Amino acid sequence: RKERERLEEKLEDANERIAELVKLEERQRIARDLHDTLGQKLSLIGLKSDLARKLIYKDPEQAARELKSVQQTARTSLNEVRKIVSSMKGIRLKDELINIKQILEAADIMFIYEEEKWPENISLLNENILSMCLKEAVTNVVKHSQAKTCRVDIQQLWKEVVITVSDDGTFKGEEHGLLGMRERLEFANGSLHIDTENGTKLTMAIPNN
Amino acid sequence: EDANERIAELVKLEERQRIARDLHDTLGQKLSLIGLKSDLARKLIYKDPEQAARELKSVQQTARTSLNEVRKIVSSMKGIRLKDELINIKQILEAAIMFIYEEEENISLLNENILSMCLKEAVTNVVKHSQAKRVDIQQLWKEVVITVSDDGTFKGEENSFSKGHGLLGMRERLEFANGSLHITENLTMAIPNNS
Ligand SMILES: Nc1ncnc2c1ncn2[C@@H]1O[C@H](COP(=O)(O)OP(=O)(O)CP(=O)(O)O)[C@@H](O)[C@H]1O
Ligand SMILES: Nc1ncnc2c1ncn2[C@@H]1O[C@H](COP(=O)(O)OP(=O)(O)CP(=O)(O)O)[C@@H](O)[C@H]1O
Ligand SMILES: [Mg+2]
Ligand SMILES: [Mg+2]
């Protein structure tokens, strides 16, 4: 009634705690990978730059040689990092749009999309969740529907980004990606609804603004 | 089970995106700076050596600090030293012997390092002497117990050697840590968890 509160909050608290443990586990895993790559390179840079400083007067040529070495190892280390950052990032929704056009065309399914109410600003996290859901919704159309047409709408409506994926095929079986998407969306305080009357239509919403 | 699995995967992902931004900014920037300054510094070796030296002291500082955090996160991590020794002994046994191990978390860095040293020596002895063709690491009550068994033949004489040898070395080091070493029919080493 009003204890429903005390409870929802103990729930909030435990979720947060579980949260920081998983979070930390990941942070450490990454810290080990970084030490394992960049570690020796950074130490080397330090050493050589120190040695080089020592040789400025004594052996200018040897110092320049050393600084060339420093330059190379800093360059390549910077690469390791660019790669990692890119890898750790996600898929932009505009890029996923292009992937699904290619996939639907390759499957001989008509793709209907017109940009309307494109989100003004969405968090990179929520954008990446939506990209993942959009990919799966279309994988399902291709694998199961036997559709000839697929309609995708991506709109900012009220305080949500709403994606609808509809097809004119037939829904297969009775009550995996559907639970996967719903769980991912619900974790983001979003929702997933499915209508299987005239083919299959997925409505996925996630908060924004 | 997945219910909790896949949610935790979502938290990791988020975390992963966050670290990604942080890296980009801090470390990516520090490496670019290092490159720049080291290049400028090279340019000044002859024309302005004093400047070149200052630049180089700076590069030194930014390289040293560059992984501080990472270094810290890994510095306070328990399980690693022994987890790395596990990898070394797999390599050594393969280069020599079938290795049988199945994962079975909390100790002290000191006691972990003592165990790594003993594990290395136990396996060096297997490789050098046994002519063998199994390692257990378990947290039992308030001890960490490591067993290293082999299917070769024991080569030791009536006496259990002395100074300059690993068996006495391991026993002495373990016993000083309030641990134990027992041993040849067909090594059990224990150390207290926190002390
Ligand atoms: N667009 C669509 N059209 C027709 N049937 C669909 C559909 N999307 C899903 N289905 C039906 O719902 C079922 C469950 O879908 P879901 O995505 O969860 O698993 P799946 O069969 O695609 C394997 P996975 O998702 O692990 O790749 C499918 O097996 C299919 O019968
Ligand atoms: N796993 C094993 N299998 C067979 N014999 C072993 C063995 N471990 C030890 N031994 C025997 O016990 C003896 C004493 O071992 P110990 O480790 O103390 O010295 P060592 O011969 O390895 C030189 P050091 O230990 O200084 O490197 C060995 O010389 C060998 O005969
Ligand atoms: Mg599916
Ligand atoms: Mg020995």
Looking at residue B141, the DSSP 8-state letter turns out to be T
Give the residue from B61, B77, B93 where a domain finishes.
B77
Exposure on the CB side of residue A88, measured as CA atoms within 13 A: 24
Claim to verify: residue B48 and residue B31 sit in the same structural domain: yes
Experimental technique used to determine this entry: X-ray
Q: What is the DSSP string of chain A?
A: --SHHHHHHHHHHHHHHHHHHHHHHHHHHHHHHHHHHHHHHHHHHHHHHHHHHHHHHH-HHHHHHHHHHHHHHHHHHHHHHHHHHHHHS---HHHHHHHHHHHHHHTT-EEE----S--S---HHHHHHHHHHHHHHHHHIIIII--SEEEEEEEEETTEEEEEEEESS---S---HHHHHHHHHHHTT-EEEEE-SSSEEEEEEEE--
The CATH number given to whatever domain includes residue A66 is 1.20.5.1930
Q: What is the dihedral of CA A39, A43, A45, A47, to 10 degrees?
A: -170
Claim to verify: residue A108 and residue A186 sit in the same structural domain: yes
Claim to verify: residue B96 and residue B11 sit in the same structural domain: no
Structure tokens at B185: 């029919």
- Ligand 4: centre distance to CA B164 (Å): 9
Query: Residue B166 is part of which domain span?
Result: 78-194
Structure tokens at B153: 């033949």
Give the residue from A41, A59, A88 where a domain finishes.
A88
In Å, how far are A91, A96, A97, A146, B126 from A138, measured between CA atoms? Answer: 15, 10, 10, 12, 57
Q: How far apart are CA A41 and CA A75, in angstroms?
A: 11
Give the residue from A57, A88, A119 where a domain finishes.
A88
Claim to verify: residue B9 and residue B68 sit in the same structural domain: yes
Claim to verify: residue A95 and residue A148 sit in the same structural domain: yes
Chain length of chain B? 195
Q: How far apart are CA A32 and CA A41, in angstroms?
A: 15
Claim to verify: residue A17 and residue A59 sit in the same structural domain: yes
Q: How far apart are CA A29 and CA B29, in angstroms?
A: 22
Structure tokens at B176: 């000083």
Q: Is the CB of A176 under 6 A from ligand 1?
A: yes
Claim to verify: residue A6 and residue A25 sit in the same structural domain: yes
Residue of A nearest to B64 (CA): A46
B7/A187 Cβ within 8 A:
yes
A26/B15 Cβ within 8 A:
yes
The CATH number given to whatever domain includes residue A118 is 3.30.565.10
- Note the resolution in Å, 1 decimal: 3.2
Claim to verify: residue B144 and residue B115 sit in the same structural domain: yes
Claim to verify: residue A61 and residue A134 sit in the same structural domain: no
In Å, how far are A48, A70, B18, B64, B92 from B24, measured between CA atoms? Answer: 25, 21, 10, 18, 38
Looking at residue B188, the DSSP 8-state letter turns out to be E
Total count of domains within chain A:
2
